Amino acid sequence: EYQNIFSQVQVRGPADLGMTEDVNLANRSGVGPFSTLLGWFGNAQLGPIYLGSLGVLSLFSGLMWFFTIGIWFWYQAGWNPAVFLRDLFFFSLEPPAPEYGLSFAAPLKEGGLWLIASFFMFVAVWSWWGRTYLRAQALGMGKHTAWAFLSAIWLWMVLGFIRPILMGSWSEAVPYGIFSHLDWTNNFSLVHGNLFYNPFHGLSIAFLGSALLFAMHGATILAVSRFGGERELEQIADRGTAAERAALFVRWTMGFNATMEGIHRWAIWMAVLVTLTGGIGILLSGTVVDNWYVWGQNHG
Amino acid sequence: DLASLAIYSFWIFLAGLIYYLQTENMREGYPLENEDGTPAANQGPFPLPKPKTFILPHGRGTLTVPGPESEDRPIALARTAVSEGFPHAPTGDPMKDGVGPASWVARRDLPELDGHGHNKIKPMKAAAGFHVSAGKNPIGLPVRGCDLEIAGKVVDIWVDIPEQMARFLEVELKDGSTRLLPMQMVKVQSNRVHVNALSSDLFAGIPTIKSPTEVTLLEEDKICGYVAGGLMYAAPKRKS
Amino acid sequence: ALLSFERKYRVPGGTLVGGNLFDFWVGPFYVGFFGVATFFFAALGIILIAWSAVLQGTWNPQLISVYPPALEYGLGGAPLAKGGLWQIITICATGAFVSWALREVEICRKLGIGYHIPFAFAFAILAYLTLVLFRPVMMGAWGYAFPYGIWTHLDWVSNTGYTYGNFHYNPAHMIAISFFFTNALALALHGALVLSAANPEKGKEMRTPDHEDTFFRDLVGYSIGTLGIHRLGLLLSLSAVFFSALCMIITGTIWFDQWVDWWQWWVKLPWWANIPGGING
Ligand code: BCL
Ligand code: BCL
Ligand code: BCL
Ligand SMILES: CC[C@H]1c2cc3[nH]c4c(c3C)C(=O)[C@H](C(=O)OC)c4c3nc(cc4[nH]c(cc(n2)[C@@H]1C)c(C(C)=O)c4C)[C@@H](C)[C@@H]3CCC(=O)OC/C=C(\C)CCC[C@H](C)CCC[C@H](C)CCCC(C)C
Ligand SMILES: COC(C)(C)C/C=C/C(C)=C/C=C/C(C)=C/C=C/C(C)=C/C=C\C=C(C)\C=C\C=C(/C)CC/C=C(\C)CCC=C(C)C
Ligand SMILES: CCCCCCCCCCCC[N+](C)(C)[O-]
Ligand SMILES: CCCCCCCCCCCC[N+](C)(C)[O-]
Ligand SMILES: CCCCCCCCCCCC[N+](C)(C)[O-]
Ligand SMILES: [Cl-]
Ligand SMILES: [Fe+3]
C-alpha cells in the first residue's frame, strides 16, 4: 500500500502572485525561489511576502529586541567569541532587582537593559497582532487567526506584564535566556507550592489535547486523500464521500460524530484554551493564591 | 474565594462550549434515520442547530445547513438480518452500483473553481507552462494492476493549477479511451505505475469523464470510490 | 441510529478475524471481534480497580491508586495485596489498547480508507509501554513504573523528574516540549485558516483555498498548503510523543545523574574550556 507522507511527483507553474481583493499589492515583494526540498512535503513557492507599515515596525522592533539581548551576551562573554559560543545557553538578561520595584528608570547593568528589550518586544508583538488582523481584512476573511493569536498574547502578557504590575515589581517577570527561563519556570512552581495543585495548570496540560486532535485530524485527511479530502472547503459547501467516511470512522469508533466545519471548531478551541487557562493560572498565582498545595487542601 | 470562583466560572463556560461544539457537528447527517429511512425516535440529547446558510462564490447559489438530507441516488442494498445494526449485502455489483468502500456522493455535476473562477484541475497538456519539476515523470509509463498485468499507459497528469500538485493520471487503455487514476492510489515506480487497488480488467469499469478538458466533483467521487472500492472487491486477484 | 447517508457504507466484510461473526453494530458503535476483546479487557480491568478498595481503603475516586509492586520484588511476581493487582491491570490496559487499535483497522477496511489513524494511535501506546514496561524491565523492578491514581501519578512525575535535578535539562525532553508547543501552534493556525475562509466577513462569499495561501504568503512569505499542513500535523504530534518516550528510556538507564551536568561536555570542550570570563570559569 502507498501512504501519503511525501509526494512522488512534483509539478510547478508560474509564480502565484496570490489573490488580490483589497490588498495594496505595492507592498508585495518579488516572488522567492522554488525549493524542491519543501515541495516534497508541502508547497515549494517562497513569497511573495507583504510588508506594510506595521510589517516594518514589528520587524524593526523585533531585531531591536533580538540585538539588545545579544549585545548583553557579548558583554558577559568579555567580547570573546569562544566564551560566547560556549556559555551561550547560560547568559541571561534579568529584570531589575526587586529593590527597584516598578520604577521605570533602573541602571542598565542592573536591569535597565531589560526594560529596553521589553519595550521592543511589546511593540513588536502587538504590531504583529494588528498585522494578522489587517491581512485577513484585506482578503475579506474572518479574523479568526488574530483572535486565536490574542490567546498566545494573553499568556505572554500575564507572564511578563500584568503579573509584574500586580505583584508590584518588575523582578517577578521572566529573564531572557535559555537555561535561565528554564530555571524560572522551575522555581515558580516551587515558590507557589507545586503548580500541579493549580487547577488551571491541570486544564492547560489537558488541552495541550491538541496533540491528540491534530494527530487524528491529520491522519484522517491523509487516510481520505484518495477521495480528495485535503480540499476541505469544497467539502463543506458540497459534502463528498471523503467527508462522509471521515464522519463515520469517528461515529463507528467512539460514538459522537463530526462534520467538516465541525472538526475545525474543535481544533481552534483546543489550542486557544491552552494559553487561555494558562494565563489565568499564572495571574492568580502569587497575586491571589500563595500556595496551591495549601489552596488545594481547602478543596477550593 | 477568588480563585475558586475563577475555576467554577470556567467549568460553566466549558459545558456551554461542548454544547456549542456538539451542535455545530450536527449540520450534516442529521436528522438520524432508521435502516428503512424513516426518521428515528431517539435523535440524541442535543437539538439541531440554527440554519446558517453559506454564500457560494462565483454565483453558485447558497447552501443552508442543516438542510433536506437525501441520497438523490439509488442504493442497491438489502437487509441481512431481521433486526437493526446488521450489515447490508449488495443486490448487484458493489463496484457498479457504488456501495460500501465504492460508495460515491451525488455532489454537483460542476467542476471546482479557483479563486479567479477558472477550473481548479486541468490536464497538463492544457496547463499554462506546467511541467514536472522533481521526481519521476509518469507520462509514458505503463500502468500495472494488482494482478501484475498491464492495463494501459499514462498519457497525461491532471494538475491542480492553484495548489500546484498532481492529482490524477490520465491512463490510456487498450481501446484508446482514457481514465483518471487518483494520485494517492497509484505507486509511481522507476519503470511502471503500479495500482494495488484495481486489477487490469477493471480499468474499463472506471467511470469516464464527459469533457476531456475538465473533471467534475460528481465525476471525481465516482472515480475515487471505484478505485478505492477495488481494494475490497477485487479479492480473487491481488498479489502485491 | 443511522446518519442520513450511512446505509450505503454498512456492507458486510473487512473483518480481520472471525469474519461475518462479529460483523455488526450496536447503535452508532461498530463491534467486530476487537470491540468484544476491548470490552473484555476493559470490563475485566474496572473489576480489579474496584477490587483495590476492599483491600485498599476508601471508595473516593480522588484517592484510589493502584501502586506497582515494590522494588524488592524486581520483575518477579507480587501478591495482589501489594502490587499483584497492578500487574494484571497493566495487562488488561494493554489488551484493551491493542484491541482498540486493531478495531480501528477493521473500521478502516470497511470504509476503504488509509490506516493512518491507528498508526498514529500506535505512538501513544508506545509511550505508555515505555513507562510501564520497557523503562522498568530495563531497570530491573516494576516499582519504577507509575501508579494508576488520579493525583498520585502527578506525584510520580514530580518525584521522578526531580531525582535527576531539574528535568528541563534532559535534552530529548527539550526536543519533545518543542513539538508539543509547535503542534499546538500548528493546530491554532490551521483551525483559524479554514474557518476564516468558510466563515468570511459578513455578506461576502466563501473564500477559496487561494485566499488561504495568499494569507500566509502575505503574513510570513510561505504557505505549506492544504495537504502540507496535514502532513505537518501528523508529524509534529507523532514526533512530540516520540521524544517523550525517548527522553524517558534514556533517563536512569544510560544516564542516571543530574541532567544539568550532562551539558558540561559542551562547556568542557578543549578549545574553550579554559578561556576565562563569561559564566563558566
Ligand atoms: C506522560 C504524561 C504523564 C502524566 C502526567 C499528567 C499531568 C502533568 C496532567 C495529567 C492529567 C491527566 N491525566 Mg495523566 N500522565 C500520564 C499518564 C496518564 C494516562 C495513561 C494511561 O497513560 C492516563 C489515562 C492519564 C489520565 C489523566 C487525566 C486524569 C488528566 C487529563 C488527561 C487529558 O486531558 O488527556 C488528553 C485527552 C483528552 C482531553 C481526551 C479525553 C480523555 C479523558 C480526560 C480521560 C479520562 C481518564 C480517566 C481518569 C481514566 C479512568 C479509567 C476508567 C477505567 C475509565 N494520565 C503520564 C505518566 N497527567 C492532568 C490533570 O488534570 O491531572 C489531575 C495534568 O495536569
Ligand atoms: C518544574 C516545572 C513545573 C511547572 C511549571 C510551569 C510554569 C511556571 C508555567 C507552566 C506552564 C505550562 N506547563 Mg507546567 N510545570 C510543571 C509540569 C508540567 C508538565 C509535565 C509534568 O510534564 C507539563 C506537560 C506541563 C505543561 C505546561 C503547559 C501546558 C503550560 C504552557 C502552555 C503553553 O503552550 O505555553 C507555550 C506558549 C506560550 C509561552 C505563549 C507565548 C506567546 C507569545 C506571544 C509567543 C511569541 C513570543 C516571541 C515574540 C517569539 C519570538 C519569535 C522568534 C521567531 C524567535 N507542565 C512542573 C510542575 N508550567 C505555564 C502555564 O500556563 O501554566 C498554567 C507556566 O507559566
Ligand atoms: C516536576 C516534573 C518535571 C518533569 C518530569 C517528567 C516526567 C517524570 C515525565 C515527563 C514527560 C513529559 N513531559 Mg516533563 N517535566 C517537567 C516539566 C515539563 C513541562 C513544563 C513547561 O513544565 C512540559 C511542557 C513538559 C513536557 C512533557 C512531555 C515531553 C512529556 C509528556 C507527554 C507525552 O508524550 O506523554 C506520552 C503519552 C502517554 C504515555 C499517553 C498514553 C495513553 C495510552 C496509549 C492510552 C490511554 C487511554 C486511556 C485508558 C483512555 C481512557 C479513555 C476512557 C474512554 C475513559 N515537562 C518538570 C521539570 N516529564 C513524560 C514522558 O517523558 O513521557 C514519555 C514523563 O514520564
Ligand atoms: C500521537 C499520540 C497522541 C494521541 C493520539 C491518538 N490518541 C488516540 C488516537 C490517536 C491518533 C486514536 O485513534 C484513539 C481514539 O480512539 O481516539 C478517539 C486514541 C485515544 N486516545 C485516548 C486518550 C489519551 N490520548 C492521550 C494522548 C495522545 N493521544 C498523544 C499526545 C492521552 C494522554 C495525554 O495521556 C490520553 C488519556 C483515548 C480517548 C483513545 C483510546 C481509547 C482506548 O484505548 O480505549 C480502549 C480502552 C478502554 C475503552 C478502557 C480500558 C480501561 C483500562 C483496562 C483501565 C485500567 C488501565 C488504565 C491505564 C487505568 C489508569 C489511568 C490512571 C491515570 C487513572
Ligand atoms: C551574535 O549576533 C548578535 C549578538 C548581534 C545577535 C544575537 C542575539 C542573541 C544571541 C539573542 C538571544 C536571545 C534570547 C536567548 C532570547 C530568549 C528569550 C526568552 C527565552 C524569553 C522568554 C520569556 C519572555 C517573556 C514571558 C516576556 C514577557 C514580556 C512581555 C510579553 C512584554 C514585556 C513588557 C515590557 C518590557 C514593559 C515595557 C513597558 C512599557 C511602558 C513600554
Ligand atoms: C521536515 C520538513 C522538510 C521536508 C522534508 C524533505 C525530505 C523529503 C525527501 C523525499 C524523498 C524523495 N522520495 C522519492 C523518497 O520521496
Ligand atoms: C531572495 C533572498 C531574500 C530572502 C528573504 C528571507 C526569507 C523571508 C521569507 C521568504 C520570503 C522570500 N522572499 C520572497 C522575500 O524573497
Ligand atoms: C476536557 C476534559 C479536561 C480534563 C479535566 C481535568 C480535570 C482537572 C481539573 C482540576 C480539578 C478542579 N477541582 C475542582 C476538582 O479541583
Ligand atoms: Cl516518527
Ligand atoms: Fe483540516
Chain A CB within 8 Å of residue B176 CB: no
Test A240 with B221 for CB contact under 8 angstroms: yes
**Which CATH architecture does the domain made up of B1-106 adopt?**
Irregular (4.10)
Cβ-proximal residues to C230 (8 Å cutoff; 6+ apart), any chain: A217, A218, A221, A222, A230
Q: Which residue of A has its CA nearest to B56?
A: A237
C96 vs chain B: nearest CA distance in angstroms?
A: 23
Distance between Cα B132 and ligand 7 center (Å): 24
Interface of A with B in 225-254 (CB under 8 A): 225-228, 231, 234, 236-244, 247
Same domain, C131 and C214: no
Please report, to the nearest 10 degrees, the dihedral formed by the alpha carbons of residues C29, C184, C96, C16 taken in order. Answer: 60
Cβ-proximal residues to C14 (8 Å cutoff; 6+ apart), any chain: B232, C23, C106, C109, C110
Asked whether residue C89 is assigned to any structural domain, the reply reads yes
Say how many C-beta atoms besides its own lie within 10 A of residue A180's C-beta: 17
Same domain, C53 and C78: yes
Residues of B in contact with A264 (CB under 8 A): none
The three three-digit cell numbers of residue C118, written as one number:
491507528
The number of folded domains in chain C is 2
3-state secondary structure of C140: coil
Return d(Cα B28, Cα A245) in angstroms, integer.
Answer: 12
Using CB atoms within 10 A of its CB, is residue C271 exposed (0-12), middle (13-18) or buried (19+)? exposed
Amino acid identity at C203: G
**Beta bridge partner(s), residue B93:** none
3-state secondary structure of C51: helix
Chain B CB within 8 Å of residue A262 CB: yes
Q: Tell me which residue in C112, C114, C187 faces A222 most closely, judged by beta carbons.
A: C114
Say how many C-beta atoms besides its own lie within 10 A of residue A171's C-beta: 19
Please indicate if the annotation marks C190 as binding a ligand: yes
Asked whether residue C273 is assigned to any structural domain, the reply reads no
Same domain, C136 and C22: yes
Q: Element (H or E) spanning C265, and its range?
A: helix C264-267
Same domain, C130 and C188: no
Q: Tell me which residue in A38, A47, A141 faces C200 most closely, judged by beta carbons.
A: A141
Residues of C in contact with B101 (CB under 8 A): 11, 110-112
Distance between Cα A268 and ligand 4 center (Å): 21
Which CATH superfamily is B107-240 part of?
Answer: Photosynthetic Reaction Center, subunit H, domain 2 (3.90.50.10)
Q: Is the peptide bond before C276 cis (omega within 30 degrees of 0)?
A: no
Same domain, C28 and C102: yes
Asked whether residue C272 is assigned to any structural domain, the reply reads no
Using CB atoms within 10 A of its CB, is residue B204 exposed (0-12), middle (13-18) or buried (19+)? middle
Resolution in A: 3.6
Q: For the residues of A229-256, what is the DSSP string, one character each?
A: TT-TTHHHHS--HHHHHHHHHHHHHHS-
Residues across chain C: 281
Q: Check if the beta carbon of residue A281 is closer than 8 Å to that of residue A295.
A: no
Interface of C with A in 19-58 (CB under 8 A): 25, 28-30
3-state secondary structure of C176: helix
Residue ranges near ligand 9 (ion) with Cβ within 5 Å: C 238
Tell which atom from ligand 7 comes closest to the C-alpha of A48: 14
Return d(Cα B25, Cα A255) in angstroms, integer.
Answer: 13
Say how many C-beta atoms besides its own lie within 10 A of residue C210's C-beta: 21
Return d(Cα C250, Cα B231) in angstroms, integer.
Answer: 42
Q: Regarding beta strands B131-135 and B54-55, do their DSSP bridges make them parallel or antiparallel, or are they unpaired?
A: unpaired
Amino acid identity at C164: Y
A218 lines ligand 8 (CB under 6 A): no
| Experimental method of this PDB entry | X-ray
Return d(Cα C77, Cα C97) in angstroms, integer.
Answer: 23
Please indicate if the annotation marks C168 as binding a ligand: no
Return d(Cα B43, Cα C208) in angstroms, integer.
Answer: 34
Return d(Cα A20, Cα A11) in angstroms, integer.
Answer: 24
Asked whether residue C275 is assigned to any structural domain, the reply reads no
**Which chains does chain B touch, 3 or more C-beta pairs < 8 A?**
A, C
Interface of B with C in 47-76 (CB under 8 A): 54-58, 69-71, 75
First to last CA, chain A: 55
Say how many C-beta atoms besides its own lie within 10 A of residue A37's C-beta: 9
B125: Cα separation from own chain's centroid: 25
Chain A CB within 8 Å of residue B26 CB: yes
Q: Check if the beta carbon of residue A73 is closer than 8 Å to that of residue C247.
A: no
Angle at alpha carbon of residue A78, lines to A76 and A79, rounded to 5°: 105
The three three-digit cell numbers of residue C45, written as one number:
480491568
Q: Element (H or E) spanning B54, and its range?
A: strand B54-55
Distance between Cα A38 and ligand 6 center (Å): 8
Q: For the residues of B166-200, what is the DSSP string, one character each?
A: EEEEEEE-TTS-EEEEEGGG-EE-SS-EE-SSS-G
Q: A48: alpha, beta or left, given left = phi > 0 and alpha = psi -120 to 50? A: beta
3-state secondary structure of B33: strand
The three three-digit cell numbers of residue C99, written as one number:
484491541
Q: Which residue of B has its CA nearest to A34?
A: B133
Residues with CB under 6 Å of ligand 7 are: A 29, 31-32, 46-49; C 221-222
Say how many C-beta atoms besides its own lie within 10 A of residue A1's C-beta: 9
Distance between Cα C193 and ligand 5 center (Å): 28
Q: For the residues of chain A, what is the DSSP string, one character each?
A: ----SS-SEEEE-S------TT--STTB-----B-HHHHHHS--B--PPB--HHHHHHHHHHHHHHHHHHHHHHHHTTT-HHHHHHSGGG--BPPPPTTTTT-S---GGGTHHHHHHHHHHHHHHHHHHHHHHHHHHTTT---HHHHHHHHHHHHHHIIIIIHHHHHT-GGGS--BSHHHHHHHHHHHHHHTT-GGG-HHHHHHHHH--HHHHHHHHHHHHHHTGGGTTT-TTHHHHS--HHHHHHHHHHHHHHS----HHHHHHHHHHHHHHHHHHHHHHHHHBTTTBS-HHHHHHTT-
Q: Tell me which residue in B107, B115, B225 faces A238 most closely, judged by beta carbons.
A: B107
The three three-digit cell numbers of residue C42, written as one number:
476493559
Listed by start position, the domains of chain B span: 1-106, 107-240
Q: Element (H or E) spanning B151, and its range?
A: strand B150-160
Cβ-proximal residues to A135 (8 Å cutoff; 6+ apart), any chain: A50, C215, C218, C219
Amino acid identity at A275: T
Return d(Cα C242, Cα C219) in angstroms, integer.
Answer: 31
Distance between Cα C229 and ligand 7 center (Å): 21
Radius of gyration for the alpha carbons in chain C, expressed in angstroms and rounded: 25
Domains and CATH numbers, chain A: 1-50 (no CATH), 53-191 (1.20.85.10)
Domain ranges, residue C192: 164-263
Residues across chain A: 300
Please indicate if the annotation marks C211 as binding a ligand: no
Q: Which residue of C has its CA nearest to A21?
A: C211
Same domain, C105 and C191: no
Cβ-proximal residues to B179 (8 Å cutoff; 6+ apart), any chain: B152, B170, B171, B173, B203, B206, B207, B208, B223
Cell 547593568, located at residue: A109
Interface mutation vs chain C, best among A11, A197, A204, A214, most C CBs within 10 Å:
A214
Q: Which residues of A90-114 are buried (b: 16+ CB within 10 A; e: fewer)?
A: bbbbbbbeeebeeeeebeeeebebb
Q: Check if the beta carbon of residue C142 is closer than 8 Å to that of residue C86.
A: yes
Cβ-proximal residues to A100 (8 Å cutoff; 6+ apart), any chain: A106, A111, A169, A170, A171
C168 lines ligand 3 (CB under 6 A): yes
C167 lines ligand 3 (CB under 6 A): yes
Chain A CB within 8 Å of residue C168 CB: yes
Same domain, C126 and C171: no
Same domain, C191 and C174: yes
Asked whether residue C108 is assigned to any structural domain, the reply reads yes
Same domain, C177 and C68: no
Say how many C-beta atoms besides its own lie within 10 A of residue A249's C-beta: 25
Backbone angles phi, psi at B62, to 5 degrees: -130, 170
Chain B CB within 8 Å of residue C25 CB: yes
Test A14 with B129 for CB contact under 8 angstroms: yes
Residues of B in contact with C191 (CB under 8 A): none
Angle at alpha carbon of residue A282, lines to A278 and A288, rounded to 5°: 135
Return d(Cα C56, Cα C69) in angstroms, integer.
Answer: 14
Residues of C in contact with A147 (CB under 8 A): 192
Test A9 with B228 for CB contact under 8 angstroms: no
Q: What is the CATH number for C178?
A: 1.20.85.10
Amino acid identity at B214: E
Same domain, C10 and C126: yes
Test B227 with A226 for CB contact under 8 angstroms: yes
Cell 504568503, located at residue: C217
Which residue in B50, B80, B36, B46 sits closest to C4, CA to CA? B36
Asked whether residue C85 is assigned to any structural domain, the reply reads yes
Same domain, C75 and C142: yes
Radius of gyration for the alpha carbons in chain A, expressed in angstroms and rounded: 24
DSSP state of C81: I
DSSP state of C132: I
